[PDB]
Design an enzyme around this catalytic site. Structure first.
Site, PDB file in Angstrom:
ATOM      1  N   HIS A  38      -2.503   7.100  -4.550  1.00 36.42           N
ATOM      2  CA  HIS A  38      -2.572   5.974  -3.639  1.00 36.42           C
ATOM      3  C   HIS A  38      -2.684   4.751  -4.522  1.00 36.42           C
ATOM      4  O   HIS A  38      -3.290   4.718  -5.590  1.00 36.42           O
ATOM      5  CB  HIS A  38      -3.841   6.138  -2.811  1.00 36.42           C
ATOM      6  CG  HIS A  38      -4.286   4.889  -2.130  1.00 36.42           C
ATOM      7  ND1 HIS A  38      -5.362   4.179  -2.615  1.00 36.42           N
ATOM      8  CD2 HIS A  38      -3.785   4.159  -1.111  1.00 36.42           C
ATOM      9  CE1 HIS A  38      -5.528   3.093  -1.877  1.00 36.42           C
ATOM     10  NE2 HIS A  38      -4.602   3.049  -0.935  1.00 36.42           N
ATOM     11  N   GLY A  44      -5.159  -3.364  16.356  1.00 37.14           N
ATOM     12  CA  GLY A  44      -3.779  -3.773  16.615  1.00 37.14           C
ATOM     13  C   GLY A  44      -2.763  -3.558  15.516  1.00 37.14           C
ATOM     14  O   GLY A  44      -1.600  -3.939  15.647  1.00 37.14           O
ATOM     15  N   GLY A  45      -3.181  -2.936  14.418  1.00 35.79           N
ATOM     16  CA  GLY A  45      -2.220  -2.629  13.382  1.00 35.79           C
ATOM     17  C   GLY A  45      -1.157  -1.635  13.782  1.00 35.79           C
ATOM     18  O   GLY A  45      -1.243  -0.922  14.777  1.00 35.79           O
ATOM     19  N   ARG A  46      -0.121  -1.528  12.957  1.00 35.63           N
ATOM     20  CA  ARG A  46       1.020  -0.668  13.238  1.00 35.63           C
ATOM     21  C   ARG A  46       0.735   0.776  12.787  1.00 35.63           C
ATOM     22  O   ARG A  46       0.669   1.116  11.622  1.00 35.63           O
ATOM     23  CB  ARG A  46       2.262  -1.225  12.539  1.00 35.63           C
ATOM     24  CG  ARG A  46       3.446  -0.401  12.902  1.00 35.63           C
ATOM     25  CD  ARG A  46       4.690  -1.041  12.418  1.00 35.63           C
ATOM     26  NE  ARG A  46       5.916  -0.477  12.920  1.00 35.63           N
ATOM     27  CZ  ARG A  46       6.625   0.474  12.342  1.00 35.63           C
ATOM     28  NH1 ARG A  46       6.160   1.012  11.236  1.00 35.63           N
ATOM     29  NH2 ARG A  46       7.738   0.905  12.880  1.00 35.63           N
ATOM     30  N   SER A  84       0.885  -1.169   0.000  1.00 32.69           N
ATOM     31  CA  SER A  84       0.000   0.000   0.000  1.00 32.69           C
ATOM     32  C   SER A  84       0.919   1.214   0.000  1.00 32.69           C
ATOM     33  O   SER A  84       1.979   1.230   0.650  1.00 32.69           O
ATOM     34  CB  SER A  84      -0.818  -0.108   1.278  1.00 32.69           C
ATOM     35  OG  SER A  84      -0.080   0.036   2.452  1.00 32.69           O
ATOM     36  N   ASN A 108      -2.754   0.109  -3.892  1.00 30.73           N
ATOM     37  CA  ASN A 108      -2.672  -1.056  -3.030  1.00 30.73           C
ATOM     38  C   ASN A 108      -2.847  -2.310  -3.877  1.00 30.73           C
ATOM     39  O   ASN A 108      -3.635  -2.306  -4.807  1.00 30.73           O
ATOM     40  CB  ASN A 108      -3.827  -0.916  -2.026  1.00 30.73           C
ATOM     41  CG  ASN A 108      -3.953  -1.975  -0.942  1.00 30.73           C
ATOM     42  OD1 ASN A 108      -3.879  -1.624   0.245  1.00 30.73           O
ATOM     43  ND2 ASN A 108      -4.185  -3.224  -1.323  1.00 30.73           N
ATOM     44  N   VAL A 109      -2.125  -3.378  -3.525  1.00 33.09           N
ATOM     45  CA  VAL A 109      -2.443  -4.726  -3.999  1.00 33.09           C
ATOM     46  C   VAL A 109      -2.242  -5.658  -2.833  1.00 33.09           C
ATOM     47  O   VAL A 109      -1.251  -5.539  -2.119  1.00 33.09           O
ATOM     48  CB  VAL A 109      -1.619  -5.164  -5.217  1.00 33.09           C
ATOM     49  CG1 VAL A 109      -2.137  -4.438  -6.488  1.00 33.09           C
ATOM     50  CG2 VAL A 109      -0.160  -4.918  -5.033  1.00 33.09           C
ATOM     51  N   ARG A 110      -3.182  -6.581  -2.657  1.00 35.78           N
ATOM     52  CA  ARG A 110      -3.135  -7.435  -1.479  1.00 35.78           C
ATOM     53  C   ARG A 110      -3.825  -8.776  -1.720  1.00 35.78           C
ATOM     54  O   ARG A 110      -4.642  -8.882  -2.622  1.00 35.78           O
ATOM     55  CB  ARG A 110      -3.668  -6.689  -0.289  1.00 35.78           C
ATOM     56  CG  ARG A 110      -5.091  -6.368  -0.402  1.00 35.78           C
ATOM     57  CD  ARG A 110      -5.667  -5.679   0.803  1.00 35.78           C
ATOM     58  NE  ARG A 110      -7.102  -5.384   0.668  1.00 35.78           N
ATOM     59  CZ  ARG A 110      -7.676  -4.444  -0.021  1.00 35.78           C
ATOM     60  NH1 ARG A 110      -6.942  -3.587  -0.710  1.00 35.78           N
ATOM     61  NH2 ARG A 110      -9.003  -4.334   0.001  1.00 35.78           N
TER      62      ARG A 110
END
Length: 291
Positions: free
Chosen positions: A97, A249-251, A83, A99-101
């Site tokens: 922007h 809980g992500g960074r 991302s 993203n690939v996931r």
């Protein structure tokens, strides 16, 4: 399991991060990405690459993450992706922007559940017709090998998703957005996301090169900053990934690379009528027909 397929996707994503960072560094010419490699206990980690105070890129982040979890609510899963958000210094270069996931959940007794997601989108300040068209043409062209209605579907999804209802305003001029993508065999979905990744560069880099040296004024930076308040509001109020990630809980610093370097807000602030500033919202953000 789908171990070998996942390893191929991971290798693609890490190469994509490298390639995108190299492309952007070449446009900048001054600053380079710095990597912050991080882990979480039992949970995987990532490689967050950031640029600051470049000749061209004021604030840029290109994140790779590969997270593992135990709890489809009870399933072991892996999620991996790239991302990025780029905030140029010059108001005449749009923010962008991409993203690939891939998500994969292992299931007791059964075949794994998986799906891809991603896209890319353009957020101009001082938009230019032919740049908006060329961006969408890259998007359309990359989709064509995959089906006649793929561009229409995912361009439309992008316009639906990157919208602030309480301001009745699009975030930008659009692009592609998709999620839950698993209707095609795995290899076709993987090809499509590789096409998306390549397309981001194909769509965005020429615009950066074409616009980065356009002359600009402090008043145009002020407009850019008020516009970047709109951007921050979408990311913080509306965007689902950012919301879930912060809630769960992500960074934090990796998630919030999307935020602009400086933003302004004012009560009832609006662009002056009859200006190029006003034409962004009066014309460019509502056109939504570029090809």
């Amino acid at each position: 399991h789908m171990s070998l397929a996942v390893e191929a996707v991971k290798d693609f994503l890490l190469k994509l991060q490298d390639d995108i960072c190299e492309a952007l560094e070449a446009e900048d010419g001054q600053a380079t990405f710095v990597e912050d490699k991080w882990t979480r206990e039992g949970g995987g980690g990532g490689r967050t690459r950031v640029m600051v105070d470049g000749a061209v890129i004021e604030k840029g982040g290109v994140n790779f993450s590969h997270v593992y979890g135990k709890g489809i609510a009870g399933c072991n899963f892996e999620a991996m992706g790239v991302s990025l958000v780029i905030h140029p210094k010059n108001p005449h270069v749009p923010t962008s922007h991409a993203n690939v996931r891939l998500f994969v959940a292992e299931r007791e007794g059964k075949e794994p559940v998986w799906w891809f997601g991603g896209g890319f989108d353009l957020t101009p300040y001082y938009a230019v017709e032919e740049d908006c068209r060329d961006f969408h043409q890259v998007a359309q062209d990359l989709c064509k090998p995959f089906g006649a209605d793929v561009y229409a579907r995912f361009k439309g999804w992008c316009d639906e998703y990157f919208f602030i209802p309480y301001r009745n305003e699009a975030r930008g001029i659009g692009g592609l957005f998709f999620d839950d993508l698993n209707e095609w065999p795995f290899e076709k979905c993987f090809e499509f996301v590789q096409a998306v990744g390549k397309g981001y560069m194909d769509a965005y880099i020429p615009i950066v090169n074409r616009r980065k040296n356009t002359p600009y004024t402090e008043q145009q930076v002020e407009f850019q900053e008020f516009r970047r308040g709109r951007y921050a509001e979408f990311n913080l109020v509306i965007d689902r990934g950012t919301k879930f990630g912060l809630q769960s809980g992500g960074r934090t610093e990796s998630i919030l690379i999307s935020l602009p370097p400086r933003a302004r807000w004012g009560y009832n602030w609006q662009p002056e009528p009859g200006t190029p500033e006003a034409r962004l919202t009066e014309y460019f953000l509502t056109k939504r027909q570029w090809v």
